[model samples]
Target: LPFKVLGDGSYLFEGKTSLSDVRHYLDLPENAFGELGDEVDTLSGLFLEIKQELPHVGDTAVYEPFRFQVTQMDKRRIIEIKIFPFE
Candidate 1:
């Protein structure tokens, strides 16, 4: 089921997982995963950029193929995230 957020506060979660795996775990509809890039390479590029600041965070903590999905509301969006093995 999709998790709902109320109020005007942001919730954050951190962990290691894959993008595809997360979609499966969340039971999101197929279309929900569509926003994500079609290739792991694209996703990997994003992680590399993020890792620049989060260096030493470890691969399993935030590595390539990390999947993330975004949901948009009136003017806000929810970013669903999952980490992947680093090394």
Candidate 2:
């Protein structure tokens, strides 16, 4: 669980993506705030699957209208994930 072990251990997704992409991927309304509760869980599941599929390379996911970026610290074998809202 790369995202699960990341910094602060709160976020569940990480990557470089746009609000438009997330809206399309999750079938969200164009004007929606992207705050769907179930949507976050759904994205979390997807992100977990992604981590399983691609363990070597870090990935990204979105939840609660926030974007996350995941990276690996190879020397320490640690995963670092960060979150920020799209501008």
Candidate 3:
């Protein structure tokens, strides 16, 4: 799974999580992440669709009830993401 639903009904995702896991977790239909074409299947790709430029720590992107916040970053990679629901 790309993320784990926390006790608070939110999700925390590792950088390596698959895009499919996110779409499934959020109950998004197929091709929900097809904005940038088939290759945009990573967390950063998701963010790319949400935001145009590169992200730093504290950067965030929202997808309806879910909020994807960049909690931690390791240079060029998003190491930790905190997904808050009902935002």
Candidate 4:
């Protein structure tokens, strides 16, 4: 999936998004998105790790400089997410 700009640097994305896309969108390279337990890969992987169960819309996850919020879902699947950066 591709990331879209909504307001300034806020990124909106849909479907099963991989960590690669997230890194590309944020201008960070591979092997730099180190966070949480397990080897991070997909965007959905973080939620499952953080929530430890199926996550619904409005659930959030943090990865250092950015915060990931679930905007839409397809049952147990992650449909859409918006990422916000902060200090």
Candidate 5:
């Protein structure tokens, strides 16, 4: 059996918004917020999977830092990231 350690729940509450003009400042597309949420869901699942596998490794570690390449953008731009540790 393997022991697993879950992360602190605080990371879930960090939200970002441009406040003044979302469309003008962030350059967000029509459905960018929802799209961003979907992306986050995908990555969160991957994070959990990686967390489950971390303890079995020997002399290695994983840093869950999100690096965005900014493949495309529109009027409103939003970049959000979260980092975690594995093993």
Candidate 6:
């Protein structure tokens, strides 16, 4: 997925997978996921949850038994997350 952070705190997520798919992949609770009404709100909440577990660049975590690698992070609040199946 390609996630972009706009200047106004909103975000653009370009991906084939739906948010529901992401929720399932992450094994997240329904309440933890946003309603897709507010992009910024949703992104912020998700980012926080992710940050708690993956705090540094190059960190990797397992979600839904898949490997998610933290590849990039800009101090200005940009992050790049790459997910992959186990090799």
Best TM-score goes to which candidate? 4
lDDT of each: 0.34, 0.44, 0.73, 0.72, 0.28, 0.46
Residue 17 lDDT in model 5? 27
Query: Pick by lDDT: which candidate is best?
Result: 3
The candidate 5 region of ten consecutive residues with least summed lDDT is 10-19
Residues 1-87, candidate 2: write the lDDT tens digits: 223323553443333334354456545576544334333333333344434544343566564455545554354332444544343
For candidate 5, write residues 8-67 as lDDT tens digits: 521111113231223233334535334343443432233333344322212122332322
Candidate 2: regions farther than 4 A off: 1-46, 49-52, 56-58, 75-78
Candidate 1, residue 44: the lDDT equals 33
Residue-level lDDT of model 3, residues 28-66, one tens digit each, is: 777755555266767666776688888899998876645
After superposition on all C-alphas, the RMSD of every candidate to the true structure, in Å, is 12.7, 10.3, 2.8, 2.3, 15.9, 10.0
lDDT of 4 by residue, 1-87 (tens): 377877676878764777777667677756645656236567777667766877888889876766789988887788888877554
Clashes of 2: 5
Q: Give one clash count per candidate, in the order shown.
A: 4, 5, 0, 0, 6, 0
TM-scores across all candidates? 0.29, 0.31, 0.71, 0.78, 0.19, 0.41
lDDT of 4 at 51: 65
Worst 10 residues of 1 by lDDT: 69-78
- Residue 20 of model 4 has an lDDT of 78
For model 6, the stretches where C-alpha displacement exceeds 4 angstroms are 1-54, 76-78
Residue 70's lDDT within candidate 1 is: 26
Better of 1 and 4 by TM-score: 4
